[PDB]
Design a protein around this ligand. Sequence first.
Ligand code: HEC
Ligand code: HEC
Lengths: 125, 125
Amino acid sequence: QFAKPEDAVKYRQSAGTLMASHFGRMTPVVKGQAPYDAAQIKANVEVLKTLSALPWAAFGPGTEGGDARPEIWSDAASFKQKQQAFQDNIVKLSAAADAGDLDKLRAAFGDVGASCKACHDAYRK
Amino acid sequence: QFAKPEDAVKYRQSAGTLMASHFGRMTPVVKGQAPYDAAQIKANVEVLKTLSALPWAAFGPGTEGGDARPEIWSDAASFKQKQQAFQDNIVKLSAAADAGDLDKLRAAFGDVGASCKACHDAYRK
Ligand code: HEC
Ligand code: HEC
């Protein structure tokens, strides 16, 4: 859906921006510094679920650029393993939120966050 | 969820970027220049549905900036009318996609597009 590689870069960076907001806004809840309203967090994680699937299709043919490392395209299976496992971790976060289980949310949140970081450490300049 | 007004601006502009991609990538389908696969478009409009609800909460207290016109905050009800009617138009687009009805999709797409433009013309610098 991108007329130029620059358009893919703009897309995936905006997806990243929105994920960071929907993920990071829960830090105070996970830490107990903000109250836990199970319904609020269930809805937010649903947003995060939708966004979490979006970046990967914007690293398609010829879309090199931004702060993507070139290792993304030449090691297609290792990068894929990492996005698929990130979204696994997102399913687990969905399950905790949908259950209204804060303990479970805290653990699942940390796993998601570790997955984000692991991919950036390998694949983001 | 924004530590500074700049963070709200970054959020709403990235929401706008992703909406433009999920909306605009259907132009060739609506025009018949790309094939119509009802399942593909149903899924895409579901993404667009989720994104379409996101910008409005990022025009909150003290979040003035970017290319938002100041008229957004002082006329809170007229701006609200416009986002609520845009999302009405999104419901109609969802209905057409969910029905797998291309004629209906074409009409609903044009209505959405008109709603985008109407709000930008009034409220975007
Ligand atoms: C690989 C499987 C990734 C996972 C998992 C996550 N991110 Fe990511 N991110 C990735 C890359 C390769 C890039 C660079 C894209 C480019 O072309 O520049 C990014 C970028 C971001 C950004 C910065 C966007 C910007 O302002 O330019 C953010 C804020 C970001 N990523 C956030 C983020 C979060 C919160 C994630 C887990 C919930 C996450 N990413 C996962 C690769 C990958
Ligand atoms: C008011 C009810 C709006 C509707 C409906 C839509 N948009 Fe919007 N848009 C609006 C404002 C006030 C702004 C400026 C925000 C800022 O602080 O700068 C925007 C911005 C955009 C952008 C540009 C983002 C950027 O690169 O800075 C885009 C691409 C955009 N809007 C797209 C878009 C589309 C495709 C819409 C309908 C599907 C749509 N907007 C609706 C206000 C409103």
